[PDB]
């Protein structure tokens, strides 16, 4: 495992290099919005982002050291959290807006175009505001996104050996913590400020979990209402959450 042999500078570089691209929506601004079409746009985008996400995950140090079934579990648990943190990051410089894509900025009012959606918009907007309040750095963001991938499913995983699989994850998590502290120390923060900021950052992960849980129930209801067809990948992802 070279993952555990990375310096903090090297972990940051690996994560930065692994970053997926910002995608465009097929948003036709001439087409009048319906609930069906807006969810059409969002699920289409999510489906395209998911493909890049899968390939990004392969590039997070430590990830491919896991068995395939363990990789599947972690992405199944974390996928919507990872989409959401990315959206919030993209939206940080657009107060009151969510930048799903450079050609698709939506505000809370447009969120009401879909039943049960506005509450989720509000939570995402609040997170973006928090990120702005904290002046979250790109290097910190990629660390947090990789923390989500590795952490979210780590407690919902057979035998005493399946436990060793969990141990590797915890060691990689510790390396990313070391990396976050390294970044903050380099930014001139005092020891006390480093610990405080680390906590502030990790506590946001609790809110991201919450939003993802709420979003998963929203997606389920959309599926039941059947007003927008869902990509097979998206359906299987939803299905993993039961």
């Amino acid at each position: 495992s070279l993952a555990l042999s990375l310096t903090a500078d090297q972990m940051v570089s690996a994560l930065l290099d692994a970053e997926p691209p910002i995608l465009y929506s097929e948003y036709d601004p001439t087409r009048p919005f319906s609930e069906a079409s807006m969810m059409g746009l969002l699920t289409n985008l999510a489906d395209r982002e998911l493909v890049h996400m899968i390939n990004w995950a392969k590039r997070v140090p430590g990830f491919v050291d896991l068995t395939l079934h363990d990789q599947v579990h972690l992405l199944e648990c974390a996928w919507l959290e990872i989409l959401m943190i990315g959206l919030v990051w993209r939206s940080m410089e657009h107060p009151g807006k969510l930048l799903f894509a450079p050609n698709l900025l939506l505000d809370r009012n447009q969120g009401k175009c879909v039943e049960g959606m506005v509450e989720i918009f509000d939570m995402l907007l609040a997170t973006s505001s928090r990120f702005r309040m904290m002046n979250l750095q790109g290097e910190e963001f990629v660390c947090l996104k990789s923390i989500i991938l590795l952490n979210s499913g780590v407690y919902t995983f057979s035998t005493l050996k399946s436990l060793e699989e969990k141990d590797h994850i915890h060691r990689v998590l510790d390396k990313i913590t070391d990396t976050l502290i390294h970044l903050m120390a380099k930014a001139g923060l005092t020891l006390q400020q480093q610990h405080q900021r680390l906590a502030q950052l990790l506590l946001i992960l609790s809110h991201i979990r919450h939003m993802s849980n709420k979003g998963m129930e929203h997606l389920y209801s959309m599926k039941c209402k059947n007003v927008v067809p869902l990509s097979d990948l998206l359906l299987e992802m939803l299905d993993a959450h039961r």
Binding site: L68, V72, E236
Partner: peptide, 10 residues
């Protein structure tokens, strides 16, 4: 046979 499983391979 999951889609995710296949993409994680391919």
């Amino acid at each position: 046979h999951k889609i995710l499983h296949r993409l994680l391979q391919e």
